[PDB]
């Protein structure tokens, strides 16, 4: 019962306090901040005709895919800014998109509880639907490609399930969290997809083994987006209370909090850079923001979006960041 | 710039396809059914 869990709840807090007393994440205070990194313009990709919620890059940092309410999934390339696949979409109420690591498949999901899989490389000049994924009652909040065959996606039914595109079935079910699950972020090791659920608690999961090893709490309001640090030693979680945090893996606790007095909005998307020193943001004031994770200070502010951003992505080789604004504009800032 | 020119030509064609679908989507009215269930929603959708 809850009486037994009370002792366990207090026991883990004592261990967390011991780690919190060892360091303060500000012992150095001499990280030599770069300063003004104001990347301005030179990318004004257009083509959509409705609101945009997702924008995912490729492994080669060449192909960019975005999903909109118009029911048209479009694949873009930043270099030549010309549309390559203006493929149609069965569901108009979509909220996420995914791009295969091998550059062969894309995924879409929305309020219809369908995770459609499309094969880009087909010997017919037109993509087809690989199969229809069903089994969720909530909504495809965020979808990612675990590999070329196995994928992991979120749902609005507090259930994250691994999928098998070969035949179609939920190999594993992770229905062990109360709030709503909003987004997930994978790992280069292809083993961790820590959640960004609505109840302000990030729960870690293990691929092919249903279990939770650590839960990260300490956020107010809701959580809308989550990222993952490149080396796997930490990750950043974006809450809806205009606050950000950096949850370390070994420390398993919050060590930094990024929030200014004047700003009160929320985070809709967050993503690290290659080095991880500079962290981007998703503030809802019709503009994006960047925070320096080294000096714990704001590096700069960039704007130019008529509507507030909804998606954000950093290329795997850097030197390009895209913003999925609610307006039908995607800009790669450089 | 040979294949690039053809790629731009394909992009222009599918740009018109997205453009022409814009009026069709905008030519239809959108209504949202709201309220508690079993309150007469069946009689207004059948």
């Amino acid at each position, epitope marked *: 019962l809850r009486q037994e869990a009370e002792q366990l709840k207090n026991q883990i807090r004592d261990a967390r306090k011991a780690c919190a007393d060892a360091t303060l994440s500000q012992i150095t205070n001499n990280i030599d901040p770069v300063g003004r990194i104001q990347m301005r313009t030179r990318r004004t990709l257009r083509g959509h005709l409705a609101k945009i919620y997702a924008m995912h890059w490729g492994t080669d940092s*060449r*192909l960019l895919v975005s999903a909109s309410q118009d029911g048209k999934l479009i694949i873009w*390339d930043s270099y*030549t800014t010309n549309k*390559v*696949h203006a493929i149609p979409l069965r569901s108009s109420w979509v909220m996420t998109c995914a791009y295969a690591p091998s*550059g062969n498949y894309v995924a879409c999901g929305g309020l219809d509880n369908i995770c459609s899989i499309y094969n880009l*490389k087909t*010997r*017919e*000049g*037109n993509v087809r639907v690989s199969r229809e994924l069903a089994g969720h009652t909530g909504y495809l909040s965020c979808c990612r490609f675990l590999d070329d065959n196995q994928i992991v996606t979120s749902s609005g039914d507090t259930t994250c399930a691994l999928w098998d595109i070969e035949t179609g079935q939920q190999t594993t079910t992770f229905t062990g969290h109360t709030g709503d699950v909003m987004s997930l972020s994978l790992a280069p090791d292809t083993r961790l997809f820590v959640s960004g659920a609505c109840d302000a608690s990030a729960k870690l999961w293990d691929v092919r083994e249903g279990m939770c090893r650590q839960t990260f709490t300490g956020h107010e309001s809701d959580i809308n987006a989550i990222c993952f640090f490149p080396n796997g030693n930490a990750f950043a979680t974006g809450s809806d209370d205009a606050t950000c945090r950096l949850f370390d893996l070994r420390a398993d606790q919050e060590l930094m909090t990024y929030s200014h007095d004047n700003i009160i909005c929320g985070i809709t998307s967050v993503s690290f850079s290659k080095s991880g020193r500079l962290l981007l943001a998703g503030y809802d004031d019709f503009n994006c923001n960047v925070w320096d994770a080294l000096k714990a200070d704001r590096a700069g502010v960039l704007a130019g979006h008529d509507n507030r951003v909804s998606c954000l992505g950093v290329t795997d080789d850097g030197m390009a960041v895209a913003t999925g604004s609610w307006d039908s504009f995607l800009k790669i800032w450089n | *710039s*040979a*294949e*690039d020119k*053809a*790629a731009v*030509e*394909r992009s222009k*064609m599918i740009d018109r396809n997205l453009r022409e679908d814009g009026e069709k989507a905008a030519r239809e009215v959108k209504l949202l059914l709201l309220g508690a269930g079993e309150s007469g929603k069946n009689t207004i959708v059948k």
Partner: single-chain antibody
Amino acid sequence: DVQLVESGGGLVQPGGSRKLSCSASGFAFSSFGMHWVRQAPEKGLEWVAYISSGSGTIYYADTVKGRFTISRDDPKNTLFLQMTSLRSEDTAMYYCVRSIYYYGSSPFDFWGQGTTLTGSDIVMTQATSSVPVTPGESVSISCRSSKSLLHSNGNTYLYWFLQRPGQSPQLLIYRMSNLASGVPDRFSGSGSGTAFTLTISRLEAEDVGVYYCMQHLEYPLTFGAGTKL
């Protein structure tokens, strides 16, 4: 299944001419560019004409400029080609070619069965005409061009075909560094600027054929001399 069987050209006479009809099956014709290729009984392949997607762009060869007319029927999924005042040099067997143009695409990846009809351009020259080969050996085929094919975008325009005896050629390597779909990983190519080579290891009995190399920079589509293997 993809079928590109073409019906048309046969016995003709000087002055009189007649048209071609290439029928599509198993694929979307409207989203593909289409090409025609001549093969003389004693010579190699040759460009004829090209129709883009939606008939938005029209090209013709110098030898048939103002003489041949190209047209397509997207609803009927059939491709036509008008001919006027056929000459003796036009006596050759025709090819129907399927192609598409986008980033990462594989142009000239499928060819039709084929029917039998009875200066500024970049010069494609192959110094070798034939090579005796044995199973299990390694052979290198060198293809050279009069103009460098390396564009500022960082990609070159090289295509390779293998002439099976009695059927249509099949694409092997496109862009000199990408293998076509269905082609084993054994086939490979290398080059820089104008000295392009193709490397084959562990020769098999089926590997016998004639290799042709093309260029696509600008648009003087010409075929190579052809090396017999």
